[PDB]
Design a protein around this ligand. Structure first.
Ligand SMILES: [Mg+2]
Ligand SMILES: [Mg+2]
Ligand SMILES: [Mg+2]
Ligand SMILES: [Mg+2]
Ligand SMILES: [Mg+2]
Ligand SMILES: [Mg+2]
Ligand SMILES: [Mg+2]
Ligand SMILES: [Mg+2]
Ligand SMILES: [Mg+2]
Ligand SMILES: [Mg+2]
Ligand SMILES: [Mg+2]
Ligand SMILES: [Mg+2]
Ligand SMILES: [Mg+2]
Ligand SMILES: [Mg+2]
Ligand SMILES: [Mg+2]
Ligand SMILES: [Mg+2]
Ligand SMILES: [Mg+2]
Ligand SMILES: [Mg+2]
Ligand SMILES: [Mg+2]
Ligand SMILES: [Mg+2]
Ligand SMILES: [Mg+2]
Ligand SMILES: [Mg+2]
Ligand SMILES: [Mg+2]
Ligand SMILES: [Mg+2]
Ligand SMILES: [Mg+2]
Ligand SMILES: [Mg+2]
Ligand SMILES: [Mg+2]
Ligand SMILES: [Mg+2]
Ligand SMILES: [Mg+2]
Ligand SMILES: [Mg+2]
Ligand SMILES: [Mg+2]
Ligand SMILES: [Mg+2]
Ligand SMILES: [Mg+2]
Ligand SMILES: [Mg+2]
Ligand SMILES: [Mg+2]
Ligand SMILES: [Mg+2]
Ligand SMILES: [Mg+2]
Ligand SMILES: [Mg+2]
Lengths: 68, 56, 138, 52, 153, 176
RNA sequence: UCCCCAGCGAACCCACUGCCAAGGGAACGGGCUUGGCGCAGUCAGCGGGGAAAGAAGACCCUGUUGAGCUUGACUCUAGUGU
RNA sequence: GUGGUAGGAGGGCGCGCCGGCGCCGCAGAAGCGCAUGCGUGCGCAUGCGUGGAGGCACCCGCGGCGCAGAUCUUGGUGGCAG
RNA sequence: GCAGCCCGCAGGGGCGGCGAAAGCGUGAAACCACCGGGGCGCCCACUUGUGGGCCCCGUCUUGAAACACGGACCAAGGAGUGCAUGUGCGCAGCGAGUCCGCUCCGCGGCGCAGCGAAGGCCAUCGAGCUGCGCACAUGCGACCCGAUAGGCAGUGAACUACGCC
RNA sequence: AACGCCCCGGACAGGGCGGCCACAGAGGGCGACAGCCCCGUAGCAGCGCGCAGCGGAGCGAGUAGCGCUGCUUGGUCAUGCA
RNA sequence: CACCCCGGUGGGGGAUCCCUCGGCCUGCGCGCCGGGCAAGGACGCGGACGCACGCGAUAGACGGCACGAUCCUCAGACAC
């Protein structure tokens, strides 16, 4: 099938609403605001994103630890 | 960002990122075959490879 | 097909080579076929047309006329044959420019060393036919 | 070489094989009259209103 | 040859004349055209001589906003009239050209009546005027293409 | 909207039409649609609906899963409307007659080396003439890698895995 | 000067524009509703109206947009001194 | 069974070019103008005129693929205004 | 592809001339001249001039005919794309495997099983891999156009400021 | 290498008929669309001349490293650099 | 009468379509400046020569070699 743009020719506000809009970056760029305004996105879908777990191994070697 | 997805690790923030396209890839292959043939013709009896050991 | 990668089949480069041909190449591009009576003697298919060449017109308005070549003009690629003319308003008769591909040479001029140039193409054609005869023999 | 999901050719013709044809229940082929909604025709289908 | 605007029904009995890119005011020469149609060929001369002598005027009807009134425009049931001497002079040379074309065709120029006049806009000849505050505005002439056709009665 | 039966069950239509333009698969789907329109048998109605299903809605069967089935329903014709795959955990399988869409080449060899026979879904009414001793099976629909990540991993008692591309130690784990 | 003429000859501006009264309406209509009128569409005056034209309000507020500037702001820093 | 903004979905119309496949054209192609017809509609087909060398249909594939607006851009032209 | 004849000081005009034609291809629209026809701007109805219905579109807005903003007209141009990585769905090949395209030849990746920070534990167990397509998320100029700013590197005292000769 | 006749037309490269060449039917020109009119296209061609002698365990400092500092790096009680 | 609308003819303008010795992209090849005066510039150089392009007081083809009959606006040049 074709892309969605080929059906949105003719309609103002291509698919993004008149009152809303397609603005540049509302909410911020990337995954910022994970503790402020996208906290609901991180409490729901990535609750283990923030913080530290466990003992760091500086340069884990894959071939030495290979044991399938 | 909006939905449930893996967190994005896309590293195109630097405007200095280059791209190495591979349009020379079929052409380099025919150049590479031609040089190997010309090496074999330069050393006609001698093998084109060295004798190399078997190592673990 | 053309299997030589180093020559163009490009239309743009072939058209630019035709209109910006130099004068040595423009002489070759203004070749004209010989008669069958000339081709039994010389052997080659065509030869570059020259002044004082006898010519029969093969296409166009003057088709079937015979006359001598009185003017060749390499820029605009036009051969002007005697007795292929049109008058101006003031009665002045102008020779009409015919392309060399529309002319067939009846009698080749041989004066200004042209008999050497005809024999050089004739002998190289004869020599190259001998090599291709030996190669197909072997 | 690729394996097809069917063995025979023209598998819709398998419908007329007697192995399938014996298996079938009898379909309803009764062609009904087109219904009418106008009150004179549907009184005329059951003309027993005037009997009382 | 260049075609004329109106239809010629009897080319034996009609004459035509032309001037292209005539350096006249188009709006002035449109208005004097509309008062020259359906006139006898010699009567159109005597009218245009009176325009130059300012005895009769040219009624300005379409291109007329701001034109001052005159008593001579009462003849044409208007008030706005003018005396476009240059367009009157261009038409005199054309009507004189109609008379010589009539005698070249052996028709009586006293019998010809001007049937059609088409005054077309010519391309604009550009010019500049210097203005206040360092601005440059166009100062263009608006020439005209004129066609006349006269038929005998 | 669904069809009822004498056994008070419903078999829904599924897709109105299959999206696959496999001409032979839609020949199979149109065939069983024609049988199901003139039959009260629910197995034909379930096969007709499952033939139009997507690849994700037709999860595959191993021969080890059909082997454990064959102890539960011995001597029957096992019908799967999926691809039957092989288990290299199991060197040989019981003898069983399996009617499926596709068989992998390894699965087809173990069934035949057991003495059993593989058949396609158009051969069903020759293998079982009155459609007798036919046992129709589905694979596990939720045994798919996408079902680990459905839902939200940060809900109250959710066992949803977090969406991550990493397999390292610094990947997101489930907080249970 | 204007005004009238010969010749020359722009720009601003321009959704579209018969004119009123009241009403309704985004609460001050040229268009709607209901009434009152006027219409040969020309010349000159004129500044009531077009909430006239100028100019993405300079006032005010908002912006997680600034800049100039100040200091008891925060973090630094040339300089002086040890 | 039939309203519909924001919005989502489906099926088509249209454009440049592609791989094919049916064809057409100096006895006049595209384009254009005016007509007639078809079409719910996007649009399509024909006639006549012009034009003077290419083009059409369908199936496929690629996409810088459809405009009334952006104080849009560029060009042209009006009214204003003799 | 001309200047013959008549007219004009001339530019030129008219009868002509060359050529298949065009006469520096085609020649749309805005717009204009003249001529011809007709007078709702649109929709409906019919016996065509009457009646009935219609405020200016776009837009933001709770609400626009608005005394809200943009729009004189017309042509042409003109705005969700590309890549990367995901996810979901559909399709496709094979399937405990799968992936040609780095290369002259992947035991490289993912999957066949997970848990824990780790020591350690290890199943009662599970279809995937790859491609194609769309939607969507993110990074990128990121639908198009738009700041005031900030920086880096340069150029100017012909205006003007001051000082010197 | 290999093309003639007829029709239409201002002109044949068009149409019709009949051939021909092809290791050449890529492309361009020629008064319309040319394998055979032209330019082209496919196709076809190699070799020679040189190389000699006399030490071989020589070894690396304002460095490495450490301390401090500044920069840098994925480099983490320091990766690099100063 | 003006005004408006529709058509015809003529204007007006340059859209459309067709064309394209141009661009763009990719691949390959080359990869060679300079006191032996470079890059760049200035000024000059044609019978009639402004621009462009060419050129350097040997100044709009000087020599060698190859080519072989035209160049052209006029005048002329040309198998020496
Ligand atoms: Mg919007
Ligand atoms: Mg949307
Ligand atoms: Mg809001
Ligand atoms: Mg906070
Ligand atoms: Mg006045
Ligand atoms: Mg000034
Ligand atoms: Mg005046
Ligand atoms: Mg009022
Ligand atoms: Mg009223
Ligand atoms: Mg007034
Ligand atoms: Mg006022
Ligand atoms: Mg503002
Ligand atoms: Mg805020
Ligand atoms: Mg609806
Ligand atoms: Mg909508
Ligand atoms: Mg087309
Ligand atoms: Mg079409
Ligand atoms: Mg676009
Ligand atoms: Mg537009
Ligand atoms: Mg719009
Ligand atoms: Mg104007
Ligand atoms: Mg033209
Ligand atoms: Mg709203
Ligand atoms: Mg409001
Ligand atoms: Mg509105
Ligand atoms: Mg108001
Ligand atoms: Mg405005
Ligand atoms: Mg457009
Ligand atoms: Mg995006
Ligand atoms: Mg900007
Ligand atoms: Mg800053
Ligand atoms: Mg600076
Ligand atoms: Mg040191
Ligand atoms: Mg009109
Ligand atoms: Mg242009
Ligand atoms: Mg390049
Ligand atoms: Mg020098
Ligand atoms: Mg010389």
């Amino acid at each position: 099938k074709d892309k969605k743009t080929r059906k949105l020719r003719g309609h103002v506000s291509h698919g993004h609403g008149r009152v809303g809009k397609h603005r540049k970056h509302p909410g911020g760029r990337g995954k910022c605001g994970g503790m402020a305004h996208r906290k609901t996105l991180f409490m729901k879908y990535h609750p283990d994103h923030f913080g530290k777990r466990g003992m760091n191994c500086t340069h884990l070697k894959k071939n030495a630890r290979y044991a399938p | 960002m909006k939905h449930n997805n893996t967190l994005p690790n896309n590293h195109f923030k630097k405007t200095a990122i280059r791209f190495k396209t591979w349009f020379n890839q079929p052409a380099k292959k025919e150049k590479r075959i031609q040089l190997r043939k010309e090496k074999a013709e330069k050393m006609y009896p001698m093998p084109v490879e060295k004798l190399r050991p078997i190592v673990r | 097909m053309k299997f030589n990668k180093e020559k163009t089949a490009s239309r743009r480069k072939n058209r630019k080579a035709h209109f910006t041909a130099n004068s040595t190449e423009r002489r070759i591009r203004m070749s004209s076929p010989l008669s069958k009576e000339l081709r039994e003697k010389y052997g080659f298919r065509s030869f570059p047309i020259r002044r004082n060449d006898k010519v029969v017109v093969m296409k166009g308005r003057f088709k079937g006329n015979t006359g001598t070549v009185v003017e060749v003009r390499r820029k605009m690629y036009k051969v002007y044959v005697d007795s292929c003319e049109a008058s101006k308003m003031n009665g002045r008769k102008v020779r009409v420019g015919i392309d060399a591909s529309n002319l067939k040479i009846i009698e080749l001029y041989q004066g200004d060393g042209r008999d050497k140039i005809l024999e050089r193409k004739m002998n190289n054609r004869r020599m190259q036919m001998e090599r291709a005869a030996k190669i197909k023999m072997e | 070489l690729p394996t097809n999901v069917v063995s025979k050719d023209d598998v819709e013709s398998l419908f007329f094989s007697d192995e399938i044809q014996a298996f079938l229940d009898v379909p309803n082929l009764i062609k009904y009259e087109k219904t009418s909604r106008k009150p004179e025709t549907i009184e005329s289908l059951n003309p027993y209103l005037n009997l009382m | 040859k260049k075609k004329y605007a109106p239809e010629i029904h009897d080319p034996g009995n009609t004459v035509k004349c032309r001037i292209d890119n005539a350096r006249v005011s188009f709006k002035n020469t449109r208005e004097t055209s509309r008062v020259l149609v359906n006139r006898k060929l010699g009567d159109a001369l005597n009218y245009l001589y009176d325009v130059i002598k300012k005895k009769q005027c040219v009624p300005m009807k379409r291109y007329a906003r701001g034109v001052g009134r005159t008593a001579q425009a009462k003849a044409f049931k208007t008030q706005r009239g003018r005396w476009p001497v240059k367009s009157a002079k261009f038409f005199i040379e054309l009507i004189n050209n109609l008379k010589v074309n009539a005698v070249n065709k052996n028709l009586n120029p006293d019998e010809m009546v001007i049937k059609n006049i088409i005054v077309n806009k010519a391309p604009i000849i550009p010019g500049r005027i210097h203005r206040a505050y360092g601005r440059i505005n166009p100062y263009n002439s608006h020439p005209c293409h004129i066609q006349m056709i006269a038929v005998k009665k | 909207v669904a069809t009822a039966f004498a056994s008070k069950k419903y078999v829904s239509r599924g897709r109105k039409k299959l999206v696959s333009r496999n001409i032979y698969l839609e020949g199979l789907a149109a065939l069983y649609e024609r049988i199901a329109k003139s039959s009260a048998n629910e197995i034909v109605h379930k096969i007709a609906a499952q033939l139009k299903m997507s690849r994700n809605n037709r999860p595959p069967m191993k021969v080890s899963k059909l082997a454990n089935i064959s102890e539960k329903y011995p001597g029957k014709v096992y019908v799967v409307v999926a691809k039957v795959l092989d288990d290299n955990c199991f060197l040989e399988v019981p003898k069983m007659q399996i009617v499926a869409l596709q068989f992998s080449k390894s699965a087809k060899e173990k069934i035949e080396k057991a003495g059993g026979s593989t058949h396609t879904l158009d051969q069903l009414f020759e293998v079982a003439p009155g459609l007798e001793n036919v046992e129709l099976f589905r694979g596990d629909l939720t045994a798919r890698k996408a079902y680990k990540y459905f839902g939200a991993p940060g809900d109250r008692h959710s066992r949803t895995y977090p969406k991550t591309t990493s397999k390292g130690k610094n990947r997101e784990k489930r907080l249970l």
